[PDB]
Design a protein around this ligand. Structure first.
Ligand SMILES: Cc1cc(=O)c(O)c(C(=O)O)[nH]1
Ligand SMILES: [Mn+2]
Ligand SMILES: [Mn+2]
Length: 179
């Protein structure tokens, strides 16, 4: 599969490893669910890129569940912030709110709704990105400066166009696996 190769060649090895690990613990084969793999890596990379653009952010995504919950519980005890039911992706120490990051092949408002409805009754901030350079964020608060946002969007668009070079983008966009 080109898709498997694309992933190994366009994401850094820690991201790939982390994606593979997660898949293989829940019985998923990256060589089979290649769209899922690409999506997991893609979303991981966005999470990492988002935290890098500020110790503004605590990274929750990309850790095992024990460590993720340890971090969340720790943030809650020391801030007062209510505990989410789902593991979010980051915590913002400046705005003092968790963030859920969405990356979607569909329209951003569509995915935004899905997410807001999945974690309704949470006060988690939501930030959605597409592969078209659209974003949607709770209360149009986008958290990052334009440069950081622009860097994420360029990376996403670039993934898309790489997939398209390799005739993989049509499969990927018509799949929702990983969202
Ligand atoms: C399907 C999905 C989408 C996300 O954006 C996400 O953060 C998670 C997560 O498991 O943390 N899962
Ligand atoms: Mn997550
Ligand atoms: Mn997410």
């Amino acid at each position: 599969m080109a898709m498997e190769d694309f992933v190994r060649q366009c994401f850094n090895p820690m991201i790939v490893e982390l994606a593979e690990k997660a898949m293989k613990e829940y019985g998923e084969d990256p060589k089979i669910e290649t769209n899922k793999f690409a999506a997991i890596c893609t979303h991981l990379e966005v999470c990492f890129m988002y935290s890098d653009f500020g110790h503004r952010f605590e990274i929750i995504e990309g850790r095992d569940r024990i460590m993720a919950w340890t971090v969340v519980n720790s943030i809650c005890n020391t801030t007062g912030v209510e505990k989410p039911k789902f593991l979010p992706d980051l915590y913002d120490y400046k705005e003092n709110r968790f963030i859920e990051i969405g990356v979607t092949r569909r329209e951003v408002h569509i995915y935004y709704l899905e997410k807001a409805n999945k974690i309704k009754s949470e006060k988690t901030h939501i930030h959605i990105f597409s592969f078209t350079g659209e974003e949607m964020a709770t209360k149009a608060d986008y958290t990052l400066d334009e440069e950081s946002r622009a860097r994420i969007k360029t990376r996403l668009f670039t993934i898309r166009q790489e997939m398209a070079s390799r005739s993989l983008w049509d499969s990927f966009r018509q799949s929702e696996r990983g969202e």
